[PDB]
Structure formats: C-alpha cells, structure tokens
C-alpha cells in the first residue's frame, strides 16, 4: 500500500528524494497517561539549522537528501525535558519519496510504518511512556504546517497528514 502527500504546485519527478530524517515537537503539560504526543516541529528554520543533519536542500518537517546514521535511528535534542526544544530524528535507512508530477508525492506505507516503529521505540525509551502518538502539525504558516521544500528554486507545499496519524504501543 502507498502513502500519498498532495502538493501545490505539482512536484516534477526529478524532485523525488530520500527522506533521511525529520524534526518534531513534543506536546507538553501533564500527560493523559501514559502517552506522549509528537507533532512535526512547532519551531522554524532555526530549529532545523541546529539539527546539523538537514543537508543541501531546504525543507520543513522532513529532511531531504541529508545525512544518515550507522545502524539504528538516532533521536537528538538540546533538552528532551523542554517542550520548546524540538527533537531531531536521523534515519539510518532512508525512505524514498517518489514525486510524479500529477500533483502528489508517494512513499511506501510498509517502509514508513517500519520507520515509525523504530522512532517510537527510541522515543518510548527516552521518555519511558508506554504509548507514542504521532499527530499532524498543531498549526502555523503554510511553509511549516506542511512538509515544504525548495527544488530547482521552486517552493513546494505538501500536506504530510498521512505521515503523522498513528498510535504505537
């Protein structure tokens, strides 16, 4: 099965990439027990620039064509206890994102689920929470609420909701 991201404008096929990582914000407050909720970063370019893993291309939510890790996915933060600090997630095995030009970009659902399972186990480890929930962006300007990216000097805005809508136990 295939996960899709609608995009405006329509990304050309040569704008296909490998997702090599991503950045997220942890919802704060006393947790509803015993769950931690994670969304694509509520921050901005500053957060992304400090991650040190973004690479050449300028993107939000997902890192494109960036660096990878050795054997396992590694999450990193300036301070995991601080909900105002974003969590930088570096994949070890990249996930292809095929753009078609029809208007949407696609990724393997099995491969992303396999990826999300690994991220969840690392987060579950760092925070100790039994369950991990990925949810869409809390809000923000168009460039951040969506997975947005610069290819060939053109800005593309892709709805990443199908990427971030699962619960892990």
């Amino acid at each position, epitope marked *: 099965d295939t996960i899709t991201l609608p995009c405006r404008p329509a990304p050309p096929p040569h704008c296909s990439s490998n997702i090599t990582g991503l950045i997220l914000t942890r919802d704060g407050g006393v947790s509803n027990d015993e769950t931690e909720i994670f969304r694509p970063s509520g921050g901005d370019m500053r957060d992304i620039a400090r991650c040190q893993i973004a690479g050449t291309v300028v993107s939000t939510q997902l890192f494109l064509n960036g660096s990878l890790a050795e054997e396992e996915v590694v999450i990193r933060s300036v301070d995991f206890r601080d909900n*105002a600090k974003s969590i930088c997630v570096q994949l070890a095995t990249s996930v292809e994102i095929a753009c078609t030009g029809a208007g949407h970009c696609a990724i393997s659902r099995a491969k992303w689920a396999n990826t999300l399972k690994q991220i969840a186990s690392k987060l579950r480890e760092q925070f100790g929470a039994r369950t991990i929930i990925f949810k869409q962006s809390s809000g923000g300007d168009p460039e951040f609420v969506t997975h947005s990216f610069n290819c060939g000097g053109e800005f593309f805005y892709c709805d990443s909701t199908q990427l971030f809508a699962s619960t892990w136990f």
Partner: antibody, heavy 121, light 104 residues
C-alpha cells in the same frame, strides 16, 4: 522598555468562547515565544501553551488540545489566545508572558496585567 | 509531569529575620528553576532564574541555590514588602506556592 498590554475583563456564558489579545512592545516580537498562563482565584499558575510568532507554530498543554487556539499578528505585535466551549472552571485571570532568555525560555521576566474571564450562567 | 513540592505551606516570620523556602523537583534537572513573588490582584514577578540569579530590579537580600533535586530561595532581613506568596517554576510546571506572613 518591554511592555505587554492585554484586553479588558470579560463575562461569558458556558459554551461560549473568549479571545484575549496581548500587544507586545519594547523588543523584536519575532525573537521570543509568547506563552499563556492562567490563574483561577485562590489557586496556582497553570501553563496553557506557547506560540512561535515567527512560524505560527504552537504547542498546547494536553488538557487544552481541541479547545485552545493561539495565533499572532506580527504586523501589529499582537498575540491572541482563544478559548472555546467555556465552562465555569475556566474562570481565571489569563496572562500572556515572555521568557527572560531565548535559550531556556521558561523564566517569565515579563507579564501582561492579566485578563479576568468569568464564566457565567 | 515534573512534580515540584514547595515547603512549607505557610512561613511565619518577623521583619528582619531570614526566610528560607524550598522546592523539591521529582527529577534531576538541576540548573533550571525560577522563583516568583505574587501579591493580591497583581501579576507574578520574577525573582530568581537559573536557580541562583537575580532578575530585574531585585535587591541583594534575595538569593537562590540548587542542591540537585532540592532548591532553596533565601530572603535575608525580611522587609514588610517581602510578605507575599512565592511559587517555584521549572519548564511549564509550577509549585503549589508558599505564603510568607508576619509572625505575631
């Protein structure tokens, strides 16, 4: 010369919604996150959420997800906090607040005068 | 949740004595804490940040220190303006408060 000025007290029936504004001045608005913190009468301080004024990105406390919406208008240096579906235990003084520093930004050096919001019937 | 337990609930002292408030954090993050002072009908005011640094316009009688899980706010020679409620903060969590009144 940092000043935070909030809108006036309001009286609201249950089920209704309230929007509280916060005009910021004396610093570069986009440089700091704006927080909202409420205080019920006779009780302590409870954090509601922050808004990144540069991106409009937000982080709300889990107990407020689905009912709170924070936005800002950088054009006029004003942040907004909207609380919908009001109930009686939402009666509180609501404060906008800003960290003293930008790194660890949770030491609230600056506060508005606070907006009293009474939920009715 | 980071649970912060302040001590004591009420502190009864006289103008000139040494006040000592404490705050225990249910973790180990020991370099970040804030202390506020609050008076009736007024916004809270920052007194101490980073466990031990004075905020804006804060006289030298106020100080703070951090013993790992434990943190303390110290008020040498209490003035009558110093009598109020005091909350401690770490990230988005606050303490339940300690009230400091005149002992009579």
């Amino acid at each position: 010369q940092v000043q935070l000025v909030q809108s006036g007290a309001e009286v609201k029936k249950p089920g209704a919604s309230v929007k509280v504004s916060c005009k910021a001045s004396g610093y570069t608005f986009t440089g700091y996150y704006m927080h909202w913190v409420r205080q019920a009468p006779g009780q302590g301080l409870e954090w509601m959420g922050w808004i990144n004024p540069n991106s409009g990105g937000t982080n709300y406390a889990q107990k407020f997800q689905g009912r709170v919406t924070m936005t800002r208008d950088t054009s006029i240096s004003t942040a907004y906090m909207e609380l919908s579906r009001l109930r009686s235990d939402d009666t509180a003084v609501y404060y906008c607040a800003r960290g003293k520093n930008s790194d660890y930004n949770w030491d609230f050096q600056h506060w508005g005068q606070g907006t009293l919001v009474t939920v009715s019937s | 949740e980071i649970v912060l337990t302040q001590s004591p609930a009420t502190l009864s002292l006289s103008p000139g004595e040494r006040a000592t408030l404490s705050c225990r954090a249910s973790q180990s993050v020991s370099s970040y804490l804030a202390w506020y002072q609050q008076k009736p009908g007024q916004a809270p005011r920052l007194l101490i940040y980073d466990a031990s640094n004075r905020a804006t316009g804060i006289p030298a009688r106020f100080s703070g220190s951090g013993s790992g899980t434990d943190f303390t706010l110290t008020i040498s020679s209490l003035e009558p303006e110093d009598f109020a409620v005091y909350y401690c903060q770490q990230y988005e969590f606050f303490g339940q408060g300690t009230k400091l009144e005149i002992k009579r």
